[PDB]
Design a protein around this ligand. Sequence first.
Ligand SMILES: C/C(=C\COP(=O)(O)OP(=O)(O)O)CO
Ligand code: F3S
Length: 314
Amino acid sequence: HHHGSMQILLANPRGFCAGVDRAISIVENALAIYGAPIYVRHEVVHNRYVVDSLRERGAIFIEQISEVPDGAILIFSAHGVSQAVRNEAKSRDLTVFDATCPLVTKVHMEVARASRRGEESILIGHAGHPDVEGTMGQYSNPEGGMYLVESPDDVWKLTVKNEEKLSFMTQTTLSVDDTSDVIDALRKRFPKIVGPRKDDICYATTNRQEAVRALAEQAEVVLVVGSKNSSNSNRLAELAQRMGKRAFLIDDAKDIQEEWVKEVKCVGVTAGASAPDILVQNVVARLQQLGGGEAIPLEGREENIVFEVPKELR
Ligand SMILES: C/C(=C\COP(=O)(O)OP(=O)(O)O)CO
Ligand code: F3S
C-alpha cells in the first residue's frame, strides 16, 4: 500500500459532481422504492461501471421510448432530452422521473425562452454529442434559428437572419479555455448578443479542469478515470496532453499499462464527473503494485453543492 519509487498525487476536486450523484440516486431510489425493472433512457451517466452496477440492481438501459412497455417507470438520463422526447413520454402510459442535471435544465430553459421570442440562438458545443440533441431540441420556432458553433472559426463563418436579436448558450462540460476563445469571438462579432456573463460551463467542470492543471504541473503522467464517451473526462485528459504530459483516459485499473509508468517519478490521477471513487482507489492500488507510494491528495477548491432527488424518490 505505501512506500516506493513513484510518487502518486490525486487531483482535488475529482470524481462525482452534484448532478451525477443525483442521477445515480434517482435510479437507485426508484429501484429500491418501486422494484426492478426500472427503465432508463440511455446511460444515466457516461460511465460503464456505474451503468453496469445499476444494470445488476435491475435498471434496464434502453435507446427509445418505443422499447418501454406501458405501465413502466422510465428515467431520463442526466444529459437531458429534447422537447420531442419529453412529449412522446408524456403521451405514453409511463411514470417518468427526470434525472436531467439541474444545470443542464438551466441551459434548456434559456434555449426554450429564446425560441418563444423568435430570437435566433447559438450553442457552443461539440457536434454529434447527446447533450447537444437535447439542448438544440428545446428550440422549436421556425421564424428563428438554432446554430451550433465549435470554434472561433465557426463564429466567423456563421450567417444569421437578424444579428440584432441573438442569444448564446454553451454546453456544460466543455474546455473552459477553448469556450472562452469562442465567446470572445462571438461578443466581438455580435456585440448586442445576449448570454451569461461567462459561459454555461458548470462548476464541476470548471473545478476539475483547474485541478487537472495543478496536477499536471507536478506529474509526468496523468491518468483520468472515465469512459471513452464521457466528454468532461475527455476534456481532462486533453488538458494534460496539451500541457505536454502523457495522459491516459482509463475506465479502470486494468487498462493501466506498465510502460506508461516505467521509470516515472510522479504519476497524477484524477476522475471525471461520472467516475466513482472505488475506481480511483483501485487505480491507486494498481499504481502501488507498480512502485507507487501513498497517494497524496493535492489541496483544492472546496465543493459544497448537492442536488436532492425528487421528494417522491427519497
Ligand atoms: C450529465 C452531464 C455530465 C456528467 O458527466 P458524464 O460523463 O455523464 O457526461 P459528459 O461529460 O456530458 O459526456 C452533463 O452533460
Ligand atoms: S452539468 Fe451537472 S451532471 Fe455534473 S458535470 Fe456538471 S454538475
